[PDB]
Nucleic acid binder design. Structure first.
Length: 258
DNA sequence: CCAGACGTTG
DNA sequence: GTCTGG
DNA sequence: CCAGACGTTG
DNA sequence: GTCTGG
């Protein structure tokens, strides 16, 4: 739960986030900070990834079922943090355990303000600890996809983006600047399908109902939203080269079968 | 009351 | 900013 | 998440 | 062993 791929050109990403608001209107989410979208096969913490959030976080009186897409910093920086640079955070907010979320100062406050987001990715990476060797085996993990340079193009034109439950916070640099929007991905106990790879997995929102209810802090309370957080077996994976290991490596090899 | 934490993974 | 520990 | 640093003096 | 940087 500490590496993803999110490599699609921005317009292909945006079309893969085609959704329906509550009135059935087919929409594309509206961008904020599109210039901060940085497509890569190898997204690490402290990089920006595109996330979905309710229009109502940005626009007074908005339909809260309308969606915005914006790049956010991976690694939640709480509103109260006092240093000038956010990378001086001395605790890991890459992830946020489902089980303890209601009693963690860093996650509960933004959750209570309805700062629920959907972190987008092609899929995520996990490294398997194998008995009696220090060599870790990396896996690419993603939603089951539909059953040549024009073949690859069509796969990625039809790709079902992975949708992970996040929480975000807003931090004003003391020294002055843009509000930093930053996220954590909620982690849960791994499903049986993933149990031999890692005992943790991200909280995956499977289909537009779960995505919608997680996003809609208007009509969905924390309590009802937390019921969406749990493992899923609706997930496939394959082993991938050691190329992904180094986050500086940004190439299609990162998620290619081995 | 104030001081100090504020987090996850293996 | 808010909570826990002492 | 892993890779790579991990220090001071002028 | 533990932290920062990517």
């Amino acid at each position: 739960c500490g590496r993803t791929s999110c490599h699609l050109p921005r317009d292909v990403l945006t079309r893969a986030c085609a959704y329906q608001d509550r009135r059935g209107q087919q929409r594309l989410p509206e961008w904020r900070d599109p210039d901060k979208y940085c497509p890569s096969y190898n997204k690490s913490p402290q990089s920006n990834s595109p996330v979905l959030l309710s229009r109502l976080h940005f626009e007074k009186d908005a339909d809260s079922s309308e969606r915005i897409i914006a790049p956010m910093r991976w690694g939640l920086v709480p509103s109260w943090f006092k240093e000038s640079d956010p990378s001086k955070l001395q605790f890991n907010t890459t992830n946020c355990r489902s089980d303890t979320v209601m009693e963690k100062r860093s996650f509960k406050v933004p959750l209570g303000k309805g700062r629920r987001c959907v972190v987008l990715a092609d899929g995520f990476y996990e490294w398997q600890r194998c008995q009696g060797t220090n060599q870790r085996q990396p896996y690419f993990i993603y939603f089951p996809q539909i059953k040549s340079p024009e073949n690859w193009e069509k796969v990625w034109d039809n790709w079902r983006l992975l949708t992970m439950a996040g929480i975000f916070d807003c931090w004003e640099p003391p020294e002055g600047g843009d509000v930093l929007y930053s996220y954590t991905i909620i982690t849960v106990d791994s499903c049986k399908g993933l149990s031999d790879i890692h005992h943790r997995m991200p909280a995956i929102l499977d289909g537009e109902e779960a995505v919608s209810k997680w996003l809609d802090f208007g009509e969905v309370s924390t309590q009802e939203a937390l019921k969406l957080i749990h493992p899923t077996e609706n997930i496939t994976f394959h082993a991938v080269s050691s190329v992904v290991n180094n986050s500086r490596n940004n190439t299609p090899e990162c998620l290619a079968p081995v």
